[model samples]
Target: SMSVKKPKRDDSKDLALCSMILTEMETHEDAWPFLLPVNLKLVPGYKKVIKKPMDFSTIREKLSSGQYPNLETFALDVRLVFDNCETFNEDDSDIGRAGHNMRKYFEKKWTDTFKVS
Candidate 1:
């Protein structure tokens, strides 16, 4: 069987950022007792890819320049969370139709972009 070689959770930069956000969001209160770094050594595959910690520096700077941030930031966060649960969308929402078709071609046989074991 070709089992997946899952990456170590501690090595994930994105996962660390999610830990901070989840702690701030307080999704579960009692979990706080075991929230220490050592205690959180391993989380499930499903919980691993919430945010990829992409470059937000430019967006952050743009926000301070304006009176407030745009709604797109919130949308981005929501889409990221969605990506965590659902397989990646093959439709052409962000890019041109050609891009969408290319994605569909690539994902036609495999599971959706976010599919896991």
Candidate 2:
């Protein structure tokens, strides 16, 4: 059996701020294509469910729901969704680098705002 470890840190405030940065990026047309799903096929046995990339709105909603207790894990989760994308694998591609840059920005934001309380 698996258990969830209770968080010793609260980065909800940082998440909100980061969400705003993502929200702003989402406003641009160029960011939309990458934000779209890399896959639409249903998972085996899922029947009606399809795999889709996480969006800023969904991330915000999850954050509000307390699904993320640690900012590092949250960032990692977001990074996986983007990094798994083969479509953005090219070094010169915007789709590839945009997410990379966003993740970098996220890390910077975290470093800038994290307080050792």
Candidate 3:
């Protein structure tokens, strides 16, 4: 497994970075498809395939509501936004392409935000 470090702070200011990252993702061009939950009927069996459906709006909602409780959960759910994408889409498809780029972006942003010296 890749290393996971626990941050020393979980206060409002520290969490504001999480919220800020979400905004950048939400406004990203590739973010359109992930802005909301997938319609259960959009593709049959999607609900079962993606057991824990996650999206930007949902993540932000949970974050603002203080449901995350810690940075780890916030990162977990944020990663889910892309994990579900990779599971549901094809590698060369539009959504798939977007998911790949977004995952890379999130990874870099996650490292920059939390991977301190």
Q: What is the C-alpha lDDT of each candidate?
A: 0.33, 0.58, 0.87
List pairs with backbone clashes in candidate 3: none
TM-score of each: 0.23, 0.55, 0.87
Q: Predictions ranked by TM-score, top down?
A: 3, 2, 1
lDDT of 1 by residue, 1-117 (tens): 269786643423333333343333333332222123211246444235433421123223333355223333533543333343233223444323433333243233123212331
Error of 3 at 35 (Å): 0.3
Q: How many residue pairs clash in each candidate?
A: 0, 0, 0
| lDDT of model number 1 | 0.33
- Cα lDDT tens digits, model 3, 1-117, are 359766655455657888888899999899888999888877797898899999988998998887988887988998998889999999899999999999899888889888751
What TM-score would you give candidate 2 relative to the actual structure?
A: 0.55
Number of the top-ranking candidate, with TM-score as the measure: 3
> Which regions of candidate 2 deviate over 4 angstroms?
1-30, 34-36, 39-53, 86-88, 115-117
The residue pairs found clashing in candidate 2 are none
What's the CA RMSD for each of the models?
Answer: 18.9, 6.7, 5.3
Q: Give the TM-score of candidate 1.
A: 0.23
* 11-113: candidate 2 lDDT, tens digit per residue: 4477676566556556755455445444446424222332445655566667678787767666765665566543335647776676676666656655666
